[PDB]
Design an enzyme around this catalytic site. Sequence first.
Site, mmCIF file in Angstrom:
data_model
loop_
_atom_site.group_PDB
_atom_site.id
_atom_site.type_symbol
_atom_site.label_atom_id
_atom_site.label_comp_id
_atom_site.label_asym_id
_atom_site.label_seq_id
_atom_site.Cartn_x
_atom_site.Cartn_y
_atom_site.Cartn_z
ATOM 1 N N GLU A 204 0.814 -1.204 0.000
ATOM 2 C CA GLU A 204 0.000 0.000 0.000
ATOM 3 C C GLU A 204 0.840 1.242 0.000
ATOM 4 O OE1 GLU A 204 -2.786 1.477 3.122
ATOM 5 O OE2 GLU A 204 -2.312 -0.549 3.793
ATOM 6 N N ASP B 75 6.931 10.330 6.337
ATOM 7 C CA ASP B 75 7.237 9.463 7.448
ATOM 8 C C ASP B 75 7.455 10.351 8.659
ATOM 9 O OD1 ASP B 75 10.131 10.029 7.870
ATOM 10 O OD2 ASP B 75 10.484 8.717 6.187
ATOM 11 N N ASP C 290 11.157 -3.026 15.364
ATOM 12 C CA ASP C 290 11.852 -1.822 14.902
ATOM 13 C C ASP C 290 10.902 -0.603 14.876
ATOM 14 O OD1 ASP C 290 14.136 -0.339 14.102
ATOM 15 O OD2 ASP C 290 13.815 -0.874 11.992
HETATM 16 N N1 LIG Z 1 6.777 -2.054 4.723
HETATM 17 C C1 LIG Z 1 7.646 -1.122 3.943
HETATM 18 O O1 LIG Z 1 8.875 -1.055 4.056
HETATM 19 C C2 LIG Z 1 7.108 -0.011 3.247
HETATM 20 C C3 LIG Z 1 5.734 0.047 2.869
HETATM 21 C C4 LIG Z 1 5.188 1.185 2.202
HETATM 22 C C5 LIG Z 1 6.023 2.283 1.977
HETATM 23 C C6 LIG Z 1 5.438 3.419 1.380
HETATM 24 C C7 LIG Z 1 6.249 4.537 1.148
HETATM 25 C C8 LIG Z 1 7.620 4.580 1.554
HETATM 26 C C9 LIG Z 1 8.136 3.429 2.148
HETATM 27 O O2 LIG Z 1 9.470 3.452 2.525
HETATM 28 C C10 LIG Z 1 7.355 2.256 2.397
HETATM 29 N N2 LIG Z 1 7.873 1.101 3.009
#
Ligand SMILES: NC(=O)c1ccc2cccc(O)c2n1
Length: 268
Positions: free
Chosen positions: A84, A91, A130
């Site tokens: 997704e 973040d 984590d």
């Molecule tokens: N479970 C995942 O590592 C994951 C899942 C979704 C992500 C969406 C954008 C940026 C990311 O680094 C993302 N990383």
Amino acid sequence: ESQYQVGPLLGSGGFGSVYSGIRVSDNLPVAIKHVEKDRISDWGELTRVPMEVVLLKKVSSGFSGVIRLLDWFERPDSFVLILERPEPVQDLFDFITERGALQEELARSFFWQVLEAVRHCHNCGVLHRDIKDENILIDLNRGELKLIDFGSGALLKDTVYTDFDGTRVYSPPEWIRYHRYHGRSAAVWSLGILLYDMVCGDIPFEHDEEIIRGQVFFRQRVSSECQHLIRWCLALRPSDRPTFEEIQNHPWMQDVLLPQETAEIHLH
Ligand SMILES: NC(=O)c1ccc2cccc(O)c2n1
């Protein structure tokens, strides 16, 4: 691959390389994550797959506080995971870098949503290992947080863990001193680091000695109740840390905003 259109590289590091993508069938935004086979310490199975895929399938199930695994592929030297992707998204590490220490009301909403996400993982037999700001995506329109990157997680169990490969500065003193921890209490310690990070704008401890000493100093103005919750999560003895239920019943945690109200007030 003809099922996905690949966009910009979003990031790379210990988790592999993650690209922005679009699912061609219905234009769904996706994140396309490449994990190299030889950087996977940890395999499970359903034919051998990374533990990460095992753990995602166990939690990828309606409740949206965890990023959902939509599909995966195997390649000669890697696995490709289709995840997704909320849009717009940022973040929590970038968000805190830009905005500084978060107002308590906003940290409360975010922290509460982290706790629901982590309770969900646990109910599903999965320990993340984590939890930290870089592993939490904010859906900026809906005010909803999503936990990502299960690449250091494990099946939840009740006996001691003696391996760890998440982020040291979020790891508890029992891991630092003995290379032993239980999953729930280590998760709670990382949640104390996370909550301090939200309200102070940086993590409390940089060095092993500081982790082990567990003395918490506040550099920003933080309510006594928040400081108390943090200091409780960061108890040196694992069994002195709150359970998720005690965290969520703590007075600092009362009257959380809904995610939607959260975005309207603090995310515009
Ligand atoms: N479970 C995942 O590592 C994951 C899942 C979704 C992500 C969406 C954008 C940026 C990311 O680094 C993302 N990383």
